[PDB]
Amino acid sequence: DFQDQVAFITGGASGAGFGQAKVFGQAGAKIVVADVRAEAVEKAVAELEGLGITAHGIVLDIMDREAYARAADEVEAVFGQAPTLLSNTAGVNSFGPIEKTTYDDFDWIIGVNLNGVINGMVTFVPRMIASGRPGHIVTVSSLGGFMGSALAGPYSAAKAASINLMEGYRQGLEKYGIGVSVCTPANIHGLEPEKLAEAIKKGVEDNALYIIPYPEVREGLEKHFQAIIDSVAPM
Amino acid sequence: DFQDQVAFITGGASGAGFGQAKVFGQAGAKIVVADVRAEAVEKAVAELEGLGITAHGIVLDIMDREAYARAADEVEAVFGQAPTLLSNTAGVNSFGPIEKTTYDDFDWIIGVNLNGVINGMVTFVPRMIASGRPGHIVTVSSLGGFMGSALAGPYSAAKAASINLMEGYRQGLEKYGIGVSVCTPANIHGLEPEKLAEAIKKGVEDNALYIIPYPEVREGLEKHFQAIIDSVAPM
């Protein structure tokens, strides 16, 4: 189903990233674990090889644009082609009052949750297009992307941009047979990493723009959006 | 009404920024024109003084965090207090296919339309809180912030974050008697700069979170949001 697909997953040495590695791998995908913690990568790829998944590890801070370029070359060296599946799953956060936020807070959080995915898109999109192969791109953003918050202001804002940016790339890349999705988990008891992983693989198969596997949020999302619509001036 | 209010307006040497300078100034506000084009600032402040508005010019690239800090000091030197009204109105854009986007495209566009407003918020928010005075903060974002696009991908994404970030600061700053709004013009024949300016001044008075003076967009905005809601998994 995903046999002879290559998947590049950021923040894949853990959580949702790793869940994806496992789920896509069990479906036949060759996997590339990109994560910053070198020890965790080593562990994670081993555990994948232990599951009969062919897997390669790359230690990478996605905020480094040149290293992101090296990795992408590495991927073509190892598996003889550019990825056919990109997952920007890496994420970080810290809580606290939005007023108290500092430049370092911003740089770090915006850096991972937005700039990290931009670097991903700029790096791979041309290579994926040049391959002339069908492909797909997921970004694990957040539900907080749909609604700014006082305690996760920076994080929510960056996720708000990744959602939008995916909305944009979907339109751009359809003509290239490359689908685009964005997953918006409810992180504001809680959906398990493998559960969410299966939701993403389904979304990829369905070529869904949005992946929101949380029936409970519907009410609040409707309410947040109505407030906006209601703000629209008459007549 | 705005007598003895101080207003710091980015991208105020032109367009919506300048419109605001005029509108708020005619209402009694002392004005600070912050814009990068030194000649345009000079012209703009003159034209304001010509209208009986007390006005000071500051040449400033908002992407420079330290200069943004110098300006904020300058503002307190000149008018003997931190601003009581902040407007992040500065904006830039360039059209083209989202796939073709480059790092410089991103840095420039994200830099002005997002990082510029973050620098604004980080600079002034503490000073405004420390003043112990009521205040207000507007960001002129965009309607494209509510919907990502193939031809204005970077721009739309940054505006998507500023909207969200304002959504967040509103919640944070209410306890400080500081309101927050975001204006989302329809820039995707067209509302005049002074017309839009009056809409913002009304929004400031009303302490409205959203300022969307474009009755026509309602249908499309409803449609975009429903698509999201419809993506929410049953049950």
Residue numbers in the entry:
A (entry chain A), B (entry chain A): 3 to 190, 226 to 272
Article, verbatim:
A cellular pathway has been characterized that performs β-aryl ether (β-ether)3 bond cleavage using three sequential Lig enzymes. The first step in the Lig pathway is a stereospecific oxidation of the benzylic alcohol in the GGE substrate to produce β-(2-methoxyphenoxy)-γ-hydroxypropiovanillone (MPHPV), which is catalyzed by nicotinamide adenine dinucleotide (NAD+)-dependent Cα-dehydrogenases LigD, LigL, LigN, and LigO. The final step consists of a GSH-dependent lyase, LigG, that catalyzes the elimination of the GSH thioether linkage in (βR)-GS-HPV to produce glutathione disulfide (GSSG) and γ-hydroxypropiovanillone (HPV).
The LigD and LigO enzymes catalyze the oxidation of the (αR)-substrates (αR,βR)-GGE and (αR,βS)-GGE, whereas LigL and LigN are specific for the α(S)-configured substrates (αS,βR)-GGE and (αS,βS)-GGE. We have solved the crystal structures of LigD, LigO, and LigL, which by amino acid sequence alignment belong to the short chain dehydrogenase/reductase (SDR) superfamily of enzymes. The SDR family is characterized as a large group of NAD(P)H (2′-phosphorylated NADH)-dependent enzymes displaying an α/β folding pattern containing a Rossman fold; this overall organization is seen in the LigD, LigO, and LigL crystal structures. The superposition of the LigD, LigO, and LigL structures using Cα atoms shows a root mean square deviation for LigD-LigO of 0.88 Å, for LigD-LigL of 0.70 Å, and for LigO-LigL of 0.93 Å, indicating that the enzymes display similar overall structural features. In these alignments, the most sequence-divergent region is in the predicted substrate binding loop. This proposed substrate binding region is disordered in all of the crystal structures solved in the apo-form (LigD, LigO, and LigL) and in the structures of the LigD·NADH and LigO·NADH complexes.
